[PDB]
């Protein structure tokens, strides 16, 4: 079987202390990245899951290891798909990293524990963000069943089925699994192949890249004579990248501080590409690929490349300070444990506006019926339209209000 990188981005959502990283470990094998220098930029893990089906039974055909000795048939497995995991945070404060991960994703995996309460505030907030940013391919997973009884787990299923009625998603598959015990993983791998079709993705579309994480490979003990370039942990949704192409990071750079700054987007050339495990020349869109650029390892250290757009040379994305948004408000607030009715937007108020991956604090200038004018403190770029989820300060930390679209 030939070595191939990620084809589709599949994420995992749940709640705190459930064990989302243990679920990722049970499916793939390699443990989470977060658990100082390398990887650390946004709260997300990295593990690649292998799907090889033995068609020489039913659900047990899709296996973790490529060599088939487990299901019964001595014949070797056939290549179907290779997937990448982008684990999103399940916390009320960490909202910008969740919405940044949702734009990267194409399919979702929901985790609800048996022993805990049925209506959870964070999972409903993740479900609302899925409905906003178009991620309808959702598989519901039960986290812990062995602590629960025979009838109580069935009653918990009935409460989940009654909860999913008014939402847009109608047909979502439900699987009972365990992370520590390691069971029924083969059924989930079967559902990933069947229920999720890969969207049409072509060579024709102009190259665009979204940077989430920042890698710097500087080793203790090793001298300055051998240095590695600043690798950007970015995700591609459109346009095929290869080795030896010019890249500009759009929003801007702070290098010089009376007067004015007149700086271009950060120019860099691709040196190395990191995909799956081994070195590869081509970058297939629909997966997290570590693009090793000429940009300094000091710039790709910690918290500098969190939600920044990248365009290829010969293309001009526009930089905006005043953005025109077409907003729609929900009935009641999602995320809070008391649920309150969403009030009308007041002029001049700080709101965390997440345009795909960019985290910006924006002030409302004019209030209308459907449209709103917003002024950004830090510049954010717009390419086409981009899916936006709005969040506001009402009670202590940030709470989601609704969805928005740029009309430019």
């Amino acid at each position: 079987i030939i070595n191939r990188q990620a084809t589709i981005n599949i994420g995992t959502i749940g709640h705190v202390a459930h064990g989302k990283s243990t679920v990722v470990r049970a499916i793939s094998g390699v443990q989470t990245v977060r658990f100082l220098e390398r990887n650390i930029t946004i709260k997300l893990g990295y593990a690649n899951a292998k799907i090889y089906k033995c068609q020489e039974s039913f659900k047990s055909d899709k296996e973790i290891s490529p060599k088939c000795q487990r299901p019964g048939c001595p014949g070797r497995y056939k290549l179907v798909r290779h997937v990448s995991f982008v684990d999103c945070p399940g916390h009320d404060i960490l909202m910008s990293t969740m919405l940044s991960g949702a734009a990267v994703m194409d399919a979702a995996l929901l985790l609800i524990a048996g022993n805990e309460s049925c209506p959870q505030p964070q999972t409903s907030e993740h479900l609302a963000a899925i409905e906003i940013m178009k991620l309808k391919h959702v598989i519901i997973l039960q986290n812990k069943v062995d602590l629960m009884r025979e009838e109580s787990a069935l009653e918990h299923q009935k409460s989940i089925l009654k909860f999913i009625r008014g939402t847009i998603a109608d047909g979502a598959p439900i699987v009972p699994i365990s992370a520590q015990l390691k069971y029924n993983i083969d059924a989930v791998n079967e559902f990933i192949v069947k229920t999720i079709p890969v969207p049409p993705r072509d060579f024709m579309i102009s190259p665009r890249l979204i940077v989430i994480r920042s890698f710097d490979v500087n080793k203790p003990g090793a001298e300055i004579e051998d240095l590695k370039g600043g690798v950007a942990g970015g995700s591609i949704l459109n346009g095929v990248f290869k080795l030896g192409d010019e890249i500009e990071i759009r929003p801007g750079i702070v290098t010089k501080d009376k007067g004015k700054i007149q700086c271009k987007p950060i120019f860099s050339n691709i040196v190395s590409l990191f995909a799956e495990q081994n070195d590869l020349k081509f970058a297939v869109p629909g997966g997290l690929i570590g693009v090793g650029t000429k940009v300094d390892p000091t710039l790709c250290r910690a918290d500098r490349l969190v939600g920044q757009v990248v365009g290829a040379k010969g293309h001009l994305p526009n930089i905006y300070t005043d953005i025109e948004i077409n907003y729609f408000l929900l009935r009641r607030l999602l995320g809070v444990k008391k649920q309150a009715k969403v009030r009308k937007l007041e002029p001049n108020e700080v709101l965390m506006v997440n345009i795909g991956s960019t985290a910006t604090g924006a002030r409302v200038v004019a209030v209308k019926a459907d449209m709103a004018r917003l002024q950004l403190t830090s510049p954010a770029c717009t390419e086409i339209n981009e899916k936006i989820a709005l969040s506001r300060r009402i009670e202590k930390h940030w709470r989601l209000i609704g969805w928005a679209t740029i009309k430019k």
Binding site: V145, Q157, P176, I177, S178, N184
Partner: peptide, 17 residues
């Protein structure tokens, strides 16, 4: 969909430590 789920749950309860 909650029809093949009940067979998967019964398979899980049968094979436990």
């Amino acid at each position: 969909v909650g029809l093949p789920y009940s067979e998967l749950l019964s398979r899980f309860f049968n094979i436990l430590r």
